């Protein structure tokens, strides 16, 4: 599923991301935009043989099990395939664990590159 901007903002708000760990809704929308282009099925393979999955590009090294990743920890207790669904529940649930792990949203490299420190509330305006 490719979400529209306002459609995803609404869904992330419903799933409790607004102000989660101090991060406004706009952070989460912007993060999805530059990580996956709002596309729930995007994946990207990494050098260490892990893969980043789904709308928030959650990795198979630490967070989900894809059955093909060396030294995986599966801290979300979830097949990575569950993070490719059109329903964002599982990625949100796992994103909540990631953003709780100490470094906040810094895990999300495209967020850190394009969203961090900007007027992120622009991503939910007009909705």
């Amino acid at each position: 599923k490719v979400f529209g901007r306002c459609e995803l903002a609404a869904a992330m708000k419903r799933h409790g991301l607004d102000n989660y760990r101090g991060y406004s809704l706009g952070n989460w929308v912007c993060a999805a935009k530059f990580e996956s282009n709002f596309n729930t099925q995007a994946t990207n393979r990494n050098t260490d043989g892990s893969t980043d999955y789904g709308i928030l590009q959650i990795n198979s090294r630490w967070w989900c099990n894809d059955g093909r990743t060396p030294g995986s920890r599966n801290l979300c207790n979830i097949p990575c395939s569950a993070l490719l669904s059109s329903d964002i529940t599982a990625s949100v649930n796992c994103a909540k664990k990631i953003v709780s792990d100490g470094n906040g949203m810094n895990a999300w490299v495209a967020w850190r590159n394009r969203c961090k420190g900007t007027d992120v509330q622009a991503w939910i305006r007009g909705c």
Partner: protein, 245 residues
Amino acid sequence: TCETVTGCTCNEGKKEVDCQGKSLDSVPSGIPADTEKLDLQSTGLATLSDATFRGLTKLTWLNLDYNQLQTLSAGVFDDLTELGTLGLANNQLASLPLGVFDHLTQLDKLYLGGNQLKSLPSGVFDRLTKLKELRLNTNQLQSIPAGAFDKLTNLQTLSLSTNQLQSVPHGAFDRLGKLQTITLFGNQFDCSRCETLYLSQWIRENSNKVKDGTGQNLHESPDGVTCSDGKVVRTVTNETLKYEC
């Protein structure tokens, strides 16, 4: 447990040295001279120099992802003529030296995603005629040089998302006859510019290649690439820009 490389792990059979996640103060001196796979990801490496990998002439896979590298030296990869995979993702690279990849004629995958690149040197990829995958996404790229990709005739995957592009030079993708996947979203294409026309027609002509990621089995997203003003790029035709162009 590496006999000759302290605090790294080894598979002498597979000619592998894994130092991933070990705090390194420099690249270890005891690496076997016949090592093929060297993993240095997340070791905290801050610099490399012309002599860092000297003598590691059998390397086919080198992983420097998630380090603190800000620049490279022109000769850092000199000896590594059989390299097939280079991981340089998620460092802090601000630039690349002229000729930095010229000895890597067998390179298959080059990961440069998640750096701070603003520009690419003249002809930096020209020697890489067997390259199948190039990741340049999530950098700060202001432009692509004319003909940057012209020698990349075997390339299948080019990732350019999340950069600062306002256009691509005319015919930028002409020579990429093996391309399967390109990422273009997250840029700021200025669709008032005449250069747009090459890009919009390309996307119309190559719409199955334009994707939101680099993996397999992902349906195309040709309308996911948008002008800085919100318009979908591929809807912009010569007639759209009749006034400007």
